[PDB]
Design a protein around this ligand. Sequence first.
Ligand SMILES: Nc1nc2c(ncn2[C@@H]2O[C@H](COP(=O)(O)OP(=O)(O)O)[C@@H](O)[C@H]2O)c(=O)[nH]1
Lengths: 420, 53
Amino acid sequence: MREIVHIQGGQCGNQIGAKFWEVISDEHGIDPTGTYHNVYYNEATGGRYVPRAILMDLEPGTMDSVRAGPFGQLFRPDNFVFGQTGAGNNWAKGHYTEGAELIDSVLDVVRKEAEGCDCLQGFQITHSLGGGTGSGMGTLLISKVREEYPDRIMETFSVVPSPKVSDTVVEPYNATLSVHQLVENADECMVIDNEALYDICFRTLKLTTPTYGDLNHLVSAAMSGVTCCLRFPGQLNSDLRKLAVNLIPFPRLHFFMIGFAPLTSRGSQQYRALTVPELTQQMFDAKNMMCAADPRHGRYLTASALFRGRMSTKEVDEQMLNVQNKNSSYFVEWIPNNIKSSICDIPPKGLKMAVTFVGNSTAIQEMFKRVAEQFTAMFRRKAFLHWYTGEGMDEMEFTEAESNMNDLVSEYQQYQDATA
Amino acid sequence: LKCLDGEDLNQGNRRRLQQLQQRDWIEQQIREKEERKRQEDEEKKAFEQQTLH
Ligand SMILES: Nc1nc2c(ncn2[C@@H]2O[C@H](COP(=O)(O)OP(=O)(O)O)[C@@H](O)[C@H]2O)c(=O)[nH]1
């Protein structure tokens, strides 16, 4: 009942998916064999539990990267859709010519995984935003399945370009090309930056060797805490749609932010207690979010706080009311009590409390503005355009894409100023 | 009709008996509440020890 088909894609998608299935298997008390010791797994002969996830890419090396790692033997080999040609870090390659004439097999797999369910609820994708195969195949699959299954919902945990210094040089192009496919065909899209994760892992946990494994672990923990209020009992249970309705006021302001709590170092853990005022004090902090956009530069159109464990709901409600009435400026007004709460009844594996924070803020628009600069400064000189043109891409689309992005940021700029 | 038992003659007995019963129940409830509170505190201490380990 209310199942989830987790699709991944690209390098970031595959790695985050590996760590995410590791964390999930840890939660439900499973070992890498796949035996216990419906929302995520599927039963198989002999009491085995196989994840309901398809893994796709154009480069068969990332398979041997994820498969050989621990908690790897779970994913059924009938799902590794790995084209044996290459990706190349280019959008039109993985969306029109090369990573497009393969999508039929991916649709076949998605259909065999969907029609075999009873009441499918929503798709949950994890992918990069500028990676060629990742972003390209992600947006193409989005278009296809959303034109195909409108009854269900869509959710994408994307990773934005590292704001300060980039990781690829053609990232603005593909980021804009993906954004123009998201706001037209999605229903829930959270954004994460590889930059604020560094500042967190270095100034919140006092780490010295932060490996991409640990950052992916943090992101995956956040992703699990998001939907943990669905597969578990709770004094007030939420889902993937109660958010989709209590958050987005208009069909496009659907770009959220993610925050996990609590995250503590060694000494800082020795000195602080686990009491929900402390978790709240850590939750709203700008240095505690997975999106490199200081919310202080904006407001929150809405913010849902999904707790876990066991606590008096009066404490939660008092903390919400105090943080809302006290920071009366950082919240917009024409939506009264713009903060939503929810309480599940299962703590993490080895804590007493837990908080996931999903926030539709009007502050991330700035990030988009940043991209709206770079792309614009990479188009009047037609820089790198001929590679994308070499796959039949009509430059016209690029234009409207940027235009689309304009409206998007313009939308937010119309609301953080709105008064009533 | 010279006398009507509908009047309460032994009101003092009713009052004192109700007082004693109420004190008894109050004592029982106080004890069980202190027990519950101490058990909650010890469970919190257990979580403290788990986290420290
Ligand atoms: N936190 C984290 N980010 C990753 C990881 N792998 C890739 N990324 C992001 O992936 C981006 C590059 O695009 P990518 O999807 O890897 O190229 P492609 O897979 O060949 O299409 C970079 O901005 C990286 O930040 C990972 O394992 N952990």
